[PDB]
Write a protein that binds this ligand. Structure first.
Ligand SMILES: N#Cc1ccnc(N2CCCCC2)c1
Length: 209
C-alpha cells in the first residue's frame, strides 16, 4: 500500500531551484546529510540520559557511508532518533516552509546555495546530485517507513518490508548519471575531511566489493 502526497508549493519551488540552478559546488550535499545525521544522533543520545530504554533499539551511535557502483547509489546511514510517519508527511514540511522562505530571500540578496544548511533545509541539497532520494527510517514510537521522491512535486510513503533497521535513518541517493564521482572512495574521503572532520560520531566509509 503506497500513499502519494503533494509537496507544499514552497518546497516544490525549493526543489526545482536546487535542480535547475547552475551551481558547480555540489559536494556540499554530503556535509548537509552528515550534519543531519549528527543532529539525529545528538537527539537520541540526549533523550537516553533520562530514559535509558530508548536505546533498547540499539546502543551504537554512528554514521555509515555506503557507495554502490552497481546500483549507482550512495547511502548515508545513521542510528539516530529516526522519524515518525507524522514527521515524514507533516512536521518536517511545516518547519521547512519558513526555512525555505528565508533561504530564498537570502539568495536574492547574494547568498549562495552552499549556505542552505543555515536555514534548516539542507536535506534538499541531496537533489544537487541525486535524481531520486529514498529515505528508510525507524523511530522508537512508530513503524519502519520508506519515503521517496524524484521531485516533480510529489513524494510517496509506504510501510517498509525490507531489512529491519532497529532505529535511525538511511538516506539512499540514486545519483545522476554525471555525478558518479561521489561513489569513489578518494572523493568521499576528500569531502569528509574538508567539511565533516569534527563530527562527534564515528563515520565509517565502506569500500566497494
Ligand atoms: N527542511 C528540511 C528537512 C530536514 C530534514 N529532513 C527533511 N526531510 C527528509 C525526510 C523526508 C522529507 C523531509 C527535511
Amino acid at each position: 500500500e503506497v500513499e502519494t502526497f503533494a509537496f507544499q508549493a514552497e518546497i516544490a519551488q525549493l526543489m526545482s531551484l536546487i535542480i535547475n540552478t547552475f551551481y558547480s559546488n555540489k559536494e556540499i550535499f554530503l556535509r548537509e546529510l552528515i550534519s543531519n545525521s549528527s543532529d539525529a544522533l545528538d537527539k537520541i543520545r540526549y533523550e537516553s540520559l533520562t530514559d535509558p530504554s530508548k536505546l533498547d533499539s540499539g546502543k551504537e551511535l554512528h554514521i555509515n557511508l555506503i557507495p554502490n557502483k552497481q546500483d549507482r547509489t550512495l547511502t548515508i546511514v545513521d542510528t539516530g532518533i529516526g522519524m515518525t510517519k507524522a514527521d515524514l508527511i507533516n512536521n518536517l514540511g511545516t518547519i521547512a516552509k519558513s526555512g525555505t522562505k528565508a533561504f530564498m530571500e537570502a539568495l536574492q540578496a547574494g547568498a549562495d546555495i552552499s549556505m542552505i544548511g543555515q536555514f534548516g533545509v539542507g536535506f534538499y541539497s541531496a537533489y544537487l546530485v541525486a535524481e531520486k532520494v529514498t529515505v528508510i527510517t525507524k523511530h522508537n514510537d512508530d513503524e519502519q517507513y520508506a519515503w521517496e521522491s524524484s521531485a516533480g512535486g510529489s513524494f510517496t510513503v509506504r510501510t517498509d518490508t525490507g531489512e529491519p533497521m532497529g532505529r535511525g535513518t538511511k538516506v539512499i541517493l540514486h545519483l545522476k548519471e554525471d555525478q558518479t564521482e561521489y561513489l569513489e572512495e578518494r572523493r568521499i574521503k576528500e569531502i569528509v575531511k574538508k567539511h565533516s572532520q569534527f563530527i562527534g560520531y564515528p563515520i565509517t566509509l565502506f569500500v566497494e566489493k
